[PDB]
Amino acid sequence: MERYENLFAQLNDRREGAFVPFVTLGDPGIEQSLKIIDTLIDAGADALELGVPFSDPLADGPTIQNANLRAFAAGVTPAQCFEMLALIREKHPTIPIGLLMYANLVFNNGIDAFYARCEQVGVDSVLVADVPVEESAPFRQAALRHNIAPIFICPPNADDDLLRQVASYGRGYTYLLSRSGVTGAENRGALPLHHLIEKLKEYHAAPALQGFGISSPEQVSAAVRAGAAGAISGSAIVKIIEKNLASPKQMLAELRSFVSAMKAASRA
C-alpha cells in the first residue's frame, strides 16, 4: 500500500505537519489499549507508532520501560498484538501504522515470516530499534518484499555517508532523532539542523519525522517550521496513561485534550 505517501501528500496539500503518537500495545490492557488508540485517532493523530512489549527495551527511558512492564502484567504477547493490529486496521483504513520493534522479536521465528505477518494485518512500517543501518540488510529486504517500509534513524550528528544510506535504504518516513540518549519527555532535544533536513531532501529521503523528547505543542510547531514533515511524541502520551491508571474515563479525556493540542500545533 502507499499509506505514508498518501498521508504526506494530503498534509502537504494543506501546508500541514504530521502529529504521530507512540503507545505500547496492550498497555495497560488489551481492551483499554484499543480504546486509547481509538481516542488518539479521533483527537487528530495522523499516524501511529505502536510498541510490541519486549523484555529488554534498551532504547527506552523509564516511562516506556514501565509501559512494557504494564503490558506484560496484563499478559500481552506478540500474537495478541498482531490480533490488535488487525482490528485497528479494520476500523481505520488509511491511517499509517508503524511498529516499534526490537530485533529479537523480528528475528525470533524468522525475519521473512515477521514481515509477512505485518503485511497480513495491514502494518505500514517497522522500526527495529537495535538494528543500525550497518546490520539492516535482511530486515530491509524482507520489509520491502512484504510492502512494509523499513524505518531508519538519522542521529543529529549524522555524517554524509550515513545520510546517503538512510535516504537510500529507508521508506515511508525518515526518523530524525532530536538527541542522543533514550526515549523520555524529561530530556528535550534540539531543533535539528537545516543541514540534516536539507541533505535528506537533497538525497530524496522519505519525509522526516522528528522524535525523542517532544512533549509540547511548541516543539511540534518548531519541528515543522524547521522543515520536518512532522513530529512523534511517546513518553508524554504514555505519562497520561500512567497518571490515570485508576481513572480510565479521565485517561481518555486527558489523552484527547493533549493529542488535540499537539495536532493543532502542526497546522499552518
Binding site: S55, L58, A59, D130, V133, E134, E135, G181
Partner: protein, 393 residues
C-alpha cells in the same frame, strides 16, 4: 564499515541503536591503534605484572588424580589480584578509556565480581566509575556492593524488567547511548556488540599464552585438552585463544546445568538455547518461545549471563571446541574435593570446569590424558552458599 570482522561465522555483529555506532567505531579504532602501540603494550604488561601479580601459577594437582592416568594442572587465576581472571581485561579496558581521553567508566554486574574489578581498575587509574546492578542482585550481594563503594564506585540499582544482570546490561547501554562522549562502557565478558568479544579475548589471552609456556616447561608437550567454565565466555576464550591453531589441543567449555538440563533451570544457551539477537549480538540465548529474554539459573551467580560470546558459538559450529554442562550438585562435589585434597578453595564458577575434568578422569581412568583446568577464581565468596547446602544434608 569496520576495521575488523564483527562476525564469527553467523554469530556476533553490532546490533545496537544507530546512536551508539560511532562509540563502537571509536572504540574499535582505539583498540586497533593500541594493539600496534609498544608503549600501550608495555603499560598493560607492567600493570599485569606489578599490580595484578602475573604470571599466575600453573599447579599440578597430584592428590586428585592418584590411581589414574590423568595428569591435571590448574591455571591459577584464583591468585590474580581481585581473586578472579576479570582483573586482566578491566585493566586493559581502563587503559583504552584513557587512550581515548575518557575519564568515566560505566559497568554492569550480576554477582558483583565484574563490578569489583571495574571499581579497582578505576580507583588505580583515576577514573570515575558507575556500576549498574539489578536490584535483586544488590540485595543478595552486599559484600561485593560494599567493596565497590569502598573503592569509590557509584552503585546504581536497576529496578526494570527482571531486576537482574540482563536488566543492568540494558541500563549500561542506555546510559552509554547518552554519555559516550565522556564515558567508556567497560563490558564484563567476551560478548555484546563488536568490538567487545574481540577486545575481551585479546585482553584475556595471556591466560592461554602463559599456560602454553608453563606446560611446555613442565611436561615438554601441549595439553590434550584445556577446560574452562562459560558464563559469557571471557575466561574460556582467554584460555582457548592461544591454542586455537594447535589442532591437537582439545578446547572444552562448560556451561552451568543448574538443576539439570531437563528441568529447564540451567544456564546452558550454547547447547540448549536458541539463536537470537540481544545485547548487541546474534548468539544462542535463554529466551521464551515468543522471543522474550530469560534468566540463566546456576548455583554459581557468576554463570548467570543469559547468552554466550559469539566466538564460542562459532568454535562450536565448526567443531573446534566442544561444550558440555555440569549440574549444581556436580560443581559442589568438585568444590569439596579440591578443598579437601589440594587445599585450594575454588570459585563455584570454576568448580564447573573442575567437575568436568574430574568426570573425564573418573569415566575413563586408564585413559592417558594431560588436562589443564582454568581455575578462573577463588571460592572464599562461596563458603556460606556451600555451608548452607551441606548443612541441609
Amino acid at each position: 564499515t569496520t576495521l575488523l570482522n564483527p562476525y564469527f561465522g553467523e554469530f556476533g555483529g553490532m546490533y545496537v541503536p544507530q546512536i551508539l555506532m560511532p562509540a563502537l567505531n571509536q572504540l574499535e579504532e582505539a583498540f586497533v591503534s593500541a594493539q600496534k602501540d609498544p608503549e600501550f603494550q608495555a603499560q598493560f604488561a607492567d600493570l599485569l605484572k606489578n599490580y595484578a601479580g602475573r604470571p599466575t601459577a600453573l599447579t599440578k594437582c597430584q592428590n586428585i588424580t592418584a590411581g589414574t592416568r590423568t595428569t591435571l594442572y590448574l591455571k591459577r587465576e584464583d591468585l590474580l589480584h581481585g581473586g578472579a581472571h576479570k582483573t586482566n581485561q578491566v585493566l586493559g579496558q581502563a587503559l583504552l578509556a584513557k587512550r581515548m581521553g575518557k575519564s568515566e567508566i560505566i559497568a554492569e554486574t550480576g554477582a558483583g565480581q565484574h563490578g569489583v574489578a571495574s571499581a579497582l581498575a578505576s580507583a588505580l587509574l583515576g577514573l570515575k566509575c558507575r556500576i549498574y546492578m539489578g536490584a535483586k542482585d544488590v540485595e543478595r550481594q552486599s559484600p561485593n556492593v560494599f567493596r565497590m563503594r569502598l573503592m569509590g564506585a557509584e552503585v546504581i540499582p536497576v529496578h526494570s524488567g527482571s531486576a537482574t544482570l540482563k536488566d543492568a546490561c540494558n541500563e549500561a547501554l542506555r546510559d552509554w547511548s547518552g554519555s559516550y562522549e565522556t564515558a567508556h562502557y567497560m563490558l564484563g565478558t567476551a560478548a555484546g556488540p563488536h568490538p567487545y568479544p574481540t577486545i575481551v579475548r585479546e585482553f584475556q589471552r595471556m591466560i592461554g599464552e602463559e599456560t602454553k609456556a608453563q606446560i611446555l616447561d613442565k611436561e615438554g608437550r601441549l595439553p590434550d585438552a584445556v577446560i574452562a567454565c562459560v558464563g559469557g565466555g571471557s575466561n574460556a576464550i582467554g584460555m582457548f585463544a592461544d591454542f586455537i591453531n594447535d589442532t591437537s589441543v582439545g578446547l572444552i567449555g562448560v556451561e552451568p546445568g543448574g538443576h539439570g538440563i531437563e528441568t529447564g533451570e540451567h544456564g546452558a544457551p550454547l547447547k540448549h538455547g536458541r539463536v537470537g539477537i540481544y545485547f548487541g549480538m546474534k548468539a544462542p540465548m535463554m529466551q521464551t518461545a515468543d522471543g522474550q529474554i530469560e534468566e540463566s539459573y546456576s548455583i554459581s551467580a557468576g554463570l548467570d549471563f543469559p547468552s554466550v560470546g559469539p566466538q564460542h558459538a562459532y568454535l562450536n559450529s565448526i567443531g573446534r571446541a566442544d561444550y558440555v554442562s555440569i549440574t549444581d550438585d556436580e560443581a559442589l562435589e568438585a568444590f569439596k574435593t579440591l578443598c579437601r585434597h589440594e587445599g585450594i578453595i575454588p570459585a563455584l564458577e570454576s568448580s564447573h570446569a573442575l567437575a568436568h575434568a574430574l568426570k573425564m578422569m573418573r569415566e575413563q581412568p586408564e585413559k592417558e590424558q594431560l588436562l589443564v583446568v582454568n581455575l578462573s577464581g577463588r571460592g572464599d565468596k562461596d563458603i556460606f552458599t556451600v555451608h548452607d547446602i551441606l548443612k541441609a544434608r
